[PDB]
Amino acid sequence: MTTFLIKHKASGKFLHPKGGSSNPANDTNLVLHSDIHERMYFQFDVVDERWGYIKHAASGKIVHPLGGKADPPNETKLVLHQDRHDRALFAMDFFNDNIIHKAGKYIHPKGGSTNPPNETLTVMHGDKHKAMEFIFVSPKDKDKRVLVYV
Amino acid sequence: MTTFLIKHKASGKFLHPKGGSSNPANDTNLVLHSDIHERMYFQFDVVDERWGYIKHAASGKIVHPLGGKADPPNETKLVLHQDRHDRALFAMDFFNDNIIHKAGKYIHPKGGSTNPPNETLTVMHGDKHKAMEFIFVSPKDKDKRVLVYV
Ligand SMILES: CC(=O)N[C@@H]1[C@@H](O)[C@@H](O)[C@@H](CO)O[C@@H]1O
Ligand SMILES: CC(=O)N[C@@H]1[C@@H](O)[C@@H](O)[C@@H](CO)O[C@@H]1O
Ligand SMILES: CC(=O)N[C@@H]1[C@@H](O)[C@@H](O)[C@@H](CO)O[C@@H]1O
Ligand SMILES: CC(=O)N[C@@H]1[C@@H](O)[C@@H](O)[C@@H](CO)O[C@@H]1O
Ligand SMILES: CC(=O)N[C@@H]1[C@@H](O)[C@@H](O)[C@@H](CO)O[C@@H]1O
Numbered sequence A, B: 001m002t003t004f005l006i007k008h009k010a011s012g013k014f015l016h017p018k019g020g021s022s023n024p025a026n027d028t029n030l031v032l033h034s035d036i037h038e039r040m041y042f043q044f045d046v047v048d049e050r051w052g053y054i055k056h057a058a059s060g061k062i063v064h065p066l067g068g069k070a071d072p073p074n075e076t077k078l079v080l081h082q083d084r085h086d087r088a089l090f091a092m093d094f095f096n097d098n099i100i101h102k103a104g105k106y107i108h109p110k111g112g113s114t115n116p117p118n119e120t121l122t123v124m125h126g127d128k129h130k131a132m133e134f135i136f137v138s139p140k141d142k143d144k145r146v147l148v149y150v
């Protein structure tokens, strides 16, 4: 099961549960932060071809739009939650370098900066540009891309 | 280990070894053809993250640029060959729906038609357009996409 870091391409910061817990509470926000440690490692659980659950490795909780909205509007915050259902399905587009939700919007840093400060929230947004690009890299070498689908 | 059909998206035809043999000779051309059977099933052997070998399931031979050059020119024919080496590396881009060789060109039907006739050759070409799109589908449901990387 590949373990990887979700690296914001423009800044080199990574996706974290806010606070960096090895067992974040349900609805903990997902933020960007420069630190690397085992509590910001992720896995991907395939459900249906490209679609699956982005899983926080330390806790097992997965990435949700807050409230579990089926078609989340722009600026809906991303959180971790233990529930599994179809409204938490994403795809890890390692060719265009983005993360897309089942209803078609992407994970962004809130406000869309190419250099978001530590603790910047992540949100859903439909726009496509350099500041929403992410790559999926080895915990052993933050420049080495790894295949999240195996 | 997923077995799949390589489906030309605009026409619905599939990638075949010319002649449909369970053991095509080395340098057998890869063509498009409407038929479905076990001698046009493929598998994908991952080598390095997105890069891997496109493997003819019945024979074990893989897709090569004819002549095995590292940086083949436009209109280089695609063939099957037993050899394994780094000039036979491709990625299966199931987000943009194409097949890309390590040096950057794509698999095309020769001449670029959206509805090529049976037996049309495939070739490498750098252009991107609707007639070089491919999707990767179940041998049991040719309209169901399947994940080729697992
Ligand atoms: C000291 C410590 O554990 N720090 C972590 C930090 O590494 C990062 O995970 C951050 C994300 O909100 O949360 C915590 O502050
Ligand atoms: C009952 C219900 O809708 N539960 C969901 C839960 O499954 C998860 O999606 C969460 C994310 O914030 O939002 C909701 O509370
Ligand atoms: C115009 C502008 O600044 N747009 C970006 C938008 O593209 C998206 O990244 C969003 C995420 O919160 O933040 C900004 O609004
Ligand atoms: C008998 C017959 O037509 N069978 C096959 C056909 O199914 C297809 O694989 C084709 C590819 O060139 O090769 C043969 O014509
Ligand atoms: C060693 C050798 O024969 N060289 C290559 C072979 O490995 C394969 O790439 C082939 C494809 O047409 O082209 C060449 O013949």
Ligand SMILES: CC(=O)N[C@H]1[C@@H](O)[C@@H](O)[C@@H](CO)O[C@@H]1O
Residues within 6 Å of the ligand: B075, B108, B109, B110, B111, B112, B113, B123, B125, B127, B128, B129, B131, B132
């Ligand atoms: C639709 C079209 O005009 N296609 C071009 C190239 O883009 C390429 O497809 C090539 C492959 O042989 O055939 C044509 O020259």
